């Protein structure tokens, strides 16, 4: 049996630390100019 | 021009007259240059705004509103939009019923925040934040997307705004969106506001209680990498506040799978989140075990090799999963079944750093609770290696990243468990450890006195050992610890003295 049934597991307190490139997806991503397009659409609807 | 002369009379119309003049001005704003002639009539700019603010005829508003949006395109256009006080009015229009109005109001506000210096402050002052949070139950996803974006813009690098959003029930609203919609751009602007809030201490618990982990979890297999990325890192940052939630089945199952990703940063991330989400919550442990988490974690450890940004979190999760739940024994066995024991023991060696070695000794401790692991662990050379880490550690304390007290406790604790097996006991005293374990009884740390008394207790079940321990003068300190404040310490001291004089 485990005598230490009350011992807690220890959280690792993650944040925004270290090299900022290890907290992105390693793979390259490149799919304003983004919301510009959908703002256009809403302006049309209102008429 | 002679168009400024026409704008003049356009400023008047104070009656039922007004209603028509708005339609006329609005229409003239559509031109490319007819948008310029109205720029340098601040009387008009300010009239367009007053009218909309006050006017209680629906179409009148959409014509004033529409007007400003046209003008919100040029770098001189927003400037006067601001200087004429349109912002607080825009923000007032965010309460309107007419969706044609709301769309103009929000698109214009967006433009301003992106470009017009002073907007951010101005919008906050008008109470835009609390307006925008309350609009988050509107139904047009394009609108939601822009609305959430505005929030992100105002929240960014501004903790006061973050707290205000928290206060307006923003977290629950944002989380509902993540649970409900599937439209990529909206999930993206929403995952962003969330990420930005997740760096606020007060918002963490709030995001969590609102079902934020489960909701993020729903989009981890989305095709949009930018979205998966925001979810993973937000999940990770929240994971320490999230150990008491239920309904985490789906998320846990997906995290296990993500351990198989080819993307390294996705793997490290998935390990981290799993490490935390396996802290103390026994239901989380059972589920992680049931979807084959031990096998995945072992595999992940082998794959990572010397990469400690991967092995430390993954070793920690393994450790959480090998104690203190209904399936902990099953997990202890699985590690052996899936060839984990040699990689585990190997991690006790260089180039491992102290934090990984800490976690690993912790894992080995749990591993040793399973009788079927006593011999295999011995075969891997766990014991001599633990004893070396122990001796080293104890020497450092006799005169970072980790404290050597933890390593001393950890190591001794692991040996305490390995001492259950008789052949292990022989190897143990075999390494001349009995004096070391007796001198440990004198440590100031009670945790250390406990594991020392523990290992002595197991060893003493054998007569030769007990005489050996008696010969070290253990009886004195044991008799004293008999009155330790620390329950365990005192409990083992009794235990050892008991066995010391059996005959």
Swiss-Prot record, chain A:
Chain segments carrying region CTNNB1-binding: 1-47
Description of its domains: Proline-rich and acidic regions are implicated in the activation functions of RNA polymerase II transcription factors.
Entry's localization field: Nucleus
Name listed for the protein in its UniProt record: Lymphoid enhancer-binding factor 1
Function description: Transcription factor that binds DNA in a sequence-specific manner. Participates in the Wnt signaling pathway. Activates transcription of target genes in the presence of CTNNB1 and EP300. PIASG antagonizes both Wnt-dependent and Wnt-independent activation by LEF1. TLE1, TLE2, TLE3 and TLE4 repress transactivation mediated by LEF1 and CTNNB1. Regulates T-cell receptor alpha enhancer function. Required for IL17A expressing gamma-delta T-cell maturation and development, via binding to regulator loci of BLK to modulate expression.
Glycyl lysine isopeptide (Lys-Gly) (interchain with G-Cter in SUMO) crosslink residues: 15
Tissue-level expression: Expressed in Vgamma1.1 and Vgamma2 gamma-delta T-cells, however not expressed in gamma-delta thymocytes fated for Il17a expression (at protein level). Expressed in alpha-beta T-cell lineages. Expressed in the thymus. Found in distinct epithelial cell compartments of the skin and is abundant in the hair-producing progenitors of the follicle.
Subunit description: Binds the armadillo repeat of CTNNB1 and forms a stable complex. Binds TLE1, ALYREF/THOC4, MDFI and MDFIC. Interacts with NLK. Interacts with EP300 and PIASG. Interacts with DAZAP2.
Family note: Belongs to the TCF/LEF family.
PTM comment, free text: Phosphorylation by NLK at these sites represses LEF1-mediated transcriptional activation of target genes of the canonical Wnt signaling pathway.
Curated annotation (Swiss-Prot), chain B:
Subcellular location, principal: cytoplasm
Tissues showing expression: Expressed in cerebellar granule neurons (at protein level). Expressed in the intestinal epithelium (at protein level). Abundantly expressed in the tooth, skin, lung, kidney, eye and brain with weak expression in the liver and heart.
Protein keywords: Acetylation, Activator, Cell adhesion, Cell junction, Cell membrane, Cell projection, Cytoplasm, Cytoskeleton, Glycoprotein, Membrane, Neurogenesis, Nucleus, Phosphoprotein, Repeat, S-nitrosylation, Synapse, Transcription, Transcription regulation, Ubl conjugation, Wnt signaling pathway
Residue numbers bearing the Phosphotyrosine modification: 181, 183
KO phenotype (gene knockout): Sympathetic ganglia-specific conditional knockout mice lead to a reduction in sympathetic ganglia size and in progenitor cell number, but does not alter sympathetic innervation of peripheral target organs.
Chain ranges passing through the membrane: none
Residues that bear Phosphoserine: 41, 96
Gene Ontology biological process terms from the UniProt entry: acinar cell differentiation; adherens junction assembly; adherens junction organization; animal organ development; anterior/posterior axis specification; apoptotic signaling pathway; astrocyte-dopaminergic neuron signaling; bone resorption
Modified residues (S-nitrosocysteine): 457
PTM description: Phosphorylated by NEK2. EGF stimulates tyrosine phosphorylation. Phosphorylation on Ser-41 and Ser-96 by CDK5. Phosphorylation by CDK2 regulates insulin internalization.
Region of interest (Interaction with BCL9), ranges: 6-28
Localization: Cytoplasm; Nucleus; Cytoplasm, Cytoskeleton; Cell junction, Adherens junction
MF terms in GO: alpha-catenin binding; cadherin binding; chromatin binding; disordered domain specific binding; DNA-binding transcription factor binding; enzyme binding; histone methyltransferase binding; I-SMAD binding
Family, similarity comment: Belongs to the beta-catenin family.
Task performed by this protein: Key downstream component of the canonical Wnt signaling pathway. In the absence of Wnt, forms a complex with AXIN1, AXIN2, APC, CSNK1A1 and GSK3B that promotes phosphorylation on N-terminal Ser and Thr residues and ubiquitination of CTNNB1 via BTRC and its subsequent degradation by the proteasome. In the presence of Wnt ligand, CTNNB1 is not ubiquitinated and accumulates in the nucleus, where it acts as a coactivator for transcription factors of the TCF/LEF family, leading to activate Wnt responsive genes. Also acts as a coactivator for other transcription factors, such as NR5A2.
Protein name stated in the entry: Catenin beta-1
Taxonomy of the source species: Eukaryota, Metazoa, Chordata, Craniata, Vertebrata
Part of the full-length chain shown: 151 to 665 of 781
């Amino acid at each position: 049996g485990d005598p230490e049934l009350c011992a807690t597991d220890e959280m690792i307190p993650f944040k925004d630390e270290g090299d900022p490139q290890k907290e992105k997806i390693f793979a390259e991503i490149s799919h304003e100019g983004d919301l510009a397009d959908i703002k256009s659409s809403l302006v049309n609807e209102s008429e | 021009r002679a168009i400024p002369e026409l704008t003049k009379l356009l400023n008047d119309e104070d009656q039922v007259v007004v209603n028509k003049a708005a339609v006329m001005v609005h229409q003239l704003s559509k031109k490319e240059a007819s948008r310029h002639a109205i720029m340098r009539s601040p009387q008009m700019v300010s009239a367009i705004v007053r009218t909309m603010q006050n006017t209680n005829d629906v179409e009148t508003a959409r014509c004033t509103a529409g007007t400003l949006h046209n003008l919100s395109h040029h770098r001189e256009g927003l400037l006067a939009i601001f200087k004429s006080g349109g912002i607080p009015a825009l923000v007032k229009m965010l309460g309107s019923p007419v969706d044609s109005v709301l769309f103009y109001a929000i698109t214009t506000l967006h433009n301003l925040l992106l470009h017009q210096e002073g907007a951010k402050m101005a919008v906050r002052l008008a109470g835009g934040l609390q307006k925008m949070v309350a609009l988050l139950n509107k139904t047009n996803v394009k609108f939601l997307a822009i609305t959430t974006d505005c929030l992100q813009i105002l929240a960014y690098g501004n903790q006061e705004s973050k707290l205000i959003i928290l206060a307006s029930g923003g977290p629950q609203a944002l989380v509902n969106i993540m649970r409900t919609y599937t439209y990529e751009k909206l999930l993206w602007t929403t995952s962003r506001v969330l990420k930005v809030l997740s760096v606020c201490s007060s918002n963490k618990p709030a995001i969590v209680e609102a079902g934020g982990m489960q909701a993020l979890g729903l989009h981890l297999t989305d095709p949009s990498q930018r979205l998966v990325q925001n979810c993973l890192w937000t999940l990770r940052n929240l994971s320490d506040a999230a150990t008491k939630q239920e309904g985490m089945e789906g998320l846990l199952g997906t995290l296990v799978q993500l351990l198989g990703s080819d993307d390294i940063n996705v793997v490290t991330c998935a390990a981290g989140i799993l490490s935390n989400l396996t802290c103390n919550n026994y239901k989380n442990k059972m589920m992680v075990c049931q979807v084959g988490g031990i096998e995945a974690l072992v595999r992940t450890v082998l794959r990572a090799g010397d990469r400690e940004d991967i092995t430390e979190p993954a070793i920690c999760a393994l450790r959480h999963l090998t104690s203190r739940h209904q399936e902990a024994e099953m997990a202890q066995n699985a590690v052996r079944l899936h060839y984990g024991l040699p990689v585990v023991v190997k991690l006790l060696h260089p180039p491992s750093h102290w934090p990984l070695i800490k976690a690993t000794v912790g894992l080995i401790r749990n591993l040793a609770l399973c009788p079927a692991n006593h011999a295999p662990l011995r075969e891997q050379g766990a014991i001599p290696r633990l004893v070396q880490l122990l001796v080293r550690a104890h020497q450092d304390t006799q005169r970072e990243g980790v404290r050597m007290e933890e390593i001393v406790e950890g190591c001794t604790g692991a040996l305490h468990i390995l001492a259950r097996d008789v052949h292990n006991r022989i190897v143990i005293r075999g390494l001349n450890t009995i004096p070391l374990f007796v001198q440990l009884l004198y440590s100031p740390i009670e945790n250390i006195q406990r594991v020392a008394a523990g290992v002595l207790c197991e060893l003493a079940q054998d007569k030769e050992a007990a005489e050996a321990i008696e010969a070290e003068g253990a009886t004195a300190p044991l008799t004293e610890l008999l009155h330790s404040r620390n329950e365990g310490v005192a409990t083992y001291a009794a235990a050892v003295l008991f066995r010391m004089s059996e005959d």
